[PDB]
Amino acid sequence: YDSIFENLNSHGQGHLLKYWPDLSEKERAQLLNDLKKIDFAEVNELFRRANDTSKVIQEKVEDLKPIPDSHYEAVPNLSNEKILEYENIGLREISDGKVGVLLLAGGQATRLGFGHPKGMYDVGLPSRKTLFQIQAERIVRVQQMAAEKYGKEGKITWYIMTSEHTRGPTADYFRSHNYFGLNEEDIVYFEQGTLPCFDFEGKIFLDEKYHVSSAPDGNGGLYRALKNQGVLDDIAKRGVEHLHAHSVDNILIKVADPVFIGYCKSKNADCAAKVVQKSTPSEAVGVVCRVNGHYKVVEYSELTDEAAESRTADGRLTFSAGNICNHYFSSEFLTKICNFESKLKLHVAKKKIPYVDHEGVRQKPTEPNGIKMEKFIFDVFEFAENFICLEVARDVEFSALKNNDAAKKDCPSTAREDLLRLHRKYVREAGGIVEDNIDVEISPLLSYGGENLTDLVSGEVFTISPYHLKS
Ligand SMILES: CC(=O)N[C@H]1[C@@H](OP(=O)(O)OP(=O)(O)OC[C@H]2O[C@@H](n3ccc(=O)[nH]c3=O)[C@H](O)[C@@H]2O)O[C@H](CO)[C@@H](O)[C@@H]1O
Ligand SMILES: [Mg+2]
């Protein structure tokens, strides 16, 4: 106790042991287990840098400039012959077993009110498939496409990053469903770290008398987790050369998109980000920018209202390159990143954090009472030697699940609506006849991105809703 107290008090966190006399021996052991999981020197060192307001005000007066339209291309503007070239390059890499996916599934947002990892959400499709199952079947299908073209049945290694409260339920969900037709050996779970939650005076919250308040350390915690969980070793052993990192909530996600992988390989990019066009200033998307001669993403929470609402001569937003958390990393760049993730800025967010008050009572604040600190995955972009930005069509590739339906944006209903609208488009683009009032869902096992539909829908008329086109 004495050595533990000193470690705490030398860093001003001695209050965490306040309730020691009232705790059972098991609660005492739980509390001590919480404390030994925290490096109080590194945490306290990190908090000071993250909350150095003088440096923050300097970053606010930076001459923030958007990525010029001249520095990126848009997939829908490419010729179909250039698209095929990129797709075939990506399909070859997938077939050769050189592609992995880094699924960011440790996020703990509560906005949705879902008592499970977000990946288990069912937005009410005719198939009633979850985000996890849809993504798994997209992996199945694109592996099949790659093997059918190039012979070898290469596998995408699915690296699923979890946090403490998602690790168990996520592994249980995939196991219960027989990995949705994928092989268990190719799905690799790894767990990101956490950081404690602080009040406005820099003292760490107690979630219970025997439990320190903590939260996942941001999706920028990927890099440290990759190293200390042995994932970089696994990547090197498997011969994986390309990594597709993306969020869990985008129901339109082109997992291991061969066009994306082929595009970045052909441009010899060490790192890349997909973007969509931002048309409302308040959309909660980061924007790709240039400052001091390198690329950056400024999170929606850190973009001034002035910059967000600034307009071009056209009337487009000046900052219109909307990040959709959909990134490419070369294996070489990834392993070099993980050796300097220490320098990665910690971002501060005001949050409503439950806490034990000065009277042993757990409160639930109605106004933000504390701070969480997060590393952001895109903060490595400024260290890339050949960063590439690739614009994609929003209706084909981005529809985020963030809020409940009452918010009416980025909700289950818009996610389900965006996917069904896209599949209606795929059916029409393959020669099928279907009106907007018909809900036709295309199984990912039948079509990854609109291919493989002519023989089934060309000339056919779809008049009954809902309809499920299956494999
Ligand atoms: C990548 C990032 O910093 N912000 C992006 C993110 O913000 P946004 O704030 O919407 O999302 P979060 O950064 O909270 O989470 C993004 C993804 O990372 C996962 N996650 C998050 C935190 C964590 O500790 N562990 C973890 O695995 C989430 O579960 C999800 O898979 O998505 C938007 C698009 O939808 C982009 O416009 C934002 O620029
Ligand atoms: Mg991102």
Question: Does residue 446 share a domain with residue 330?
Answer: no
Q: Judge whether 311 lies within some domain.
A: yes
Cα of 8 vs centre of ligand 2, distance in Å, is 34
Annotated binding site for UDP-N-acetyl-alpha-D-glucosamine: 104, 106-107, 192, 218-219, 248, 286, 299-300, 323, 402
Question: Does residue 431 share a domain with residue 372?
Answer: no
337, 295, 320, 89 alpha-carbon torsion, rounded to 10°: -60
Q: What residues make up the domain containing 452?
A: 416-471
Any residues with CB less than 8 A from the CB of 14 and at least 6 apart, and which?
5, 8
Task: Please identify which residue in the block is written with the tokens 């288990």.
Answer: 120
Ligand 1 binding site (Cβ under 6 Å of any ligand atom): 104-107, 109, 161, 163, 192, 216-219, 221, 247-249, 284-286, 297, 299, 323-325, 376-378, 400, 402
Q: Judge whether 53 lies within some domain.
A: no
Task: Ligand 1 pocket test: pick from 252, 274, 296, 325 the residue with the most ligand atoms within 8 Å of its Cβ.
Answer: 325
Question: Does residue 427 share a domain with residue 347?
Answer: no
Any residues with CB less than 8 A from the CB of 408 and at least 6 apart, and which?
414
- Taken in order 309, 373, 187, 156, the sign of the CA dihedral is positive
- Taken in order 331, 233, 139, 103, the sign of the CA dihedral is negative
Question: Does residue 304 share a domain with residue 218?
Answer: yes
Question: Does residue 303 share a domain with residue 204?
Answer: yes
Q: How many residues appear in the chain?
A: 471
Q: Which of 402, 424, 459 represents a domain boundary (last residue)?
A: 402
For residue 471, the one-letter residue type is S
Cα of 456 vs centre of ligand 2, distance in Å, is 37
Question: Does residue 233 share a domain with residue 143?
Answer: yes
Any residues with CB less than 8 A from the CB of 235 and at least 6 apart, and which?
100, 157, 159, 243, 331, 334, 335
Cα of 419 vs centre of ligand 1, distance in Å, is 20
Q: Judge whether 25 lies within some domain.
A: no
**Nearest in space to 37 (alpha carbons), one of 191, 162, 226, 223:** 191
Question: Does residue 152 share a domain with residue 72?
Answer: yes
Here the tokens at position 239 are 């011969």
C-beta separation of 271 from 245 below 8 A: no
Ligand 1 atom nearest the C-alpha of 118 is 29
Q: Which residues pair with 255 in a beta bridge?
A: none
Please state, in angstroms and rounded to a whole number, the distance separating the CA atoms of residues 378 and 159: 18
In three state form, how does the secondary structure of the chain look? CHHHHHHHHHCCCHHHHCCHHHCCHHHHHHHHHHHHCCCHHHHHHHHHHHCCHHHHHHHHCCCCEECCHHHCEEHHHCCHHHHHHHHHHHHHHHHCCCEEEEEECCCCCCCCCCCCCHHHCCCCCCCCCCHHHHHHHHHHHHHHHHHHHHCCCCCCEEEEEECHHHHHHHHHHHHHCHHHHCCHHHEEEEECCEEECEECCCCECEEECCEECEEECCHHHHHHHHHHCCHHHHHHHHCCCEEEEEECCECCCCCCCHHHHHHHHHCCCCEEEEEEECCCCCCCCCEEEEECCEEEEECHHHCCHHHHHCECCCCCECCCEEEEEEEEEEHHHHHHHCCCHHHCCCEEEEECCCEECCCCCEECCCCCCEEEEECCHHHHHHHCCCEEEEECCHHHHCCECCCCHHHCCCCHHHHHHHHHHHHHHHHHHCCCEECCCCCEEECCCCCCCCCCCHHHHCCCEECCCCEEECC
Q: Judge whether 460 lies within some domain.
A: yes
| Phi, then psi, of 261 in degrees rounded to 5 | -65, -45
Question: Does residue 390 share a domain with residue 441?
Answer: no
Burial of residue 361 (number of CB atoms within 10 Å: 0-12, 13-18, 19+): exposed
Please state, in angstroms and rounded to a whole number, the distance separating the CA atoms of residues 46 and 57: 18
Nearest Cα residue to atom 2 of ligand 1: 376
Question: Does residue 248 share a domain with residue 208?
Answer: yes
25 Rama sector, left if φ>0, alpha if ψ -120 to 50, beta otherwise: alpha
Q: Which of 402, 431, 459 represents a domain boundary (last residue)?
A: 402
Residue 120 has a CB neighbour count (10 Å cut-off) of 18
Cα of 382 vs centre of ligand 2, distance in Å, is 13
Question: Does residue 440 share a domain with residue 346?
Answer: no
Q: Judge whether 33 lies within some domain.
A: no
C-beta separation of 147 from 154 below 8 A: yes
Nearest Cα residue to atom 6 of ligand 1: 325
| Phi, then psi, of 324 in degrees rounded to 5 | -115, 25
Q: Judge whether 24 lies within some domain.
A: no
Please state, in angstroms and rounded to a whole number, the distance separating the CA atoms of residues 345 and 363: 31
C-beta separation of 65 from 290 below 8 A: yes
Q: Judge whether 434 lies within some domain.
A: yes
Q: Which residues pair with 72 in a beta bridge?
A: none
452, 454, 456, 460 alpha-carbon torsion, rounded to 10°: 150
Domain count, the chain: 2
Q: Judge whether 29 lies within some domain.
A: no
Angle formed by the axes of helices 131-150 and 258-266, to 10°? 60
Question: Does residue 125 share a domain with residue 99?
Answer: yes
| Cα end-to-end distance, the chain, whole Å | 62
Please state, in angstroms and rounded to a whole number, the distance separating the CA atoms of residues 297 and 377: 10
Cα of 219 vs centre of ligand 1, distance in Å, is 6
Here the tokens at position 329 are 């990393």
- Provide the CATH number for the domain around residue 297: 3.90.550.10
Ligand at shortest distance from the CA of 222: 1
Instruction: Please tell me what resolution, in angstroms, this structure has.
Output: 2.1
Q: Which of 376, 402, 428 represents a domain boundary (last residue)?
A: 402
For residue 437, the one-letter residue type is N
Question: Does residue 372 share a domain with residue 449?
Answer: no
b/e code 254-279 from CB counts within 10 Å (16+ = b):
bbbbbbbbbbbbeeebbbbbbbbebe
For residue 26, the one-letter residue type is K
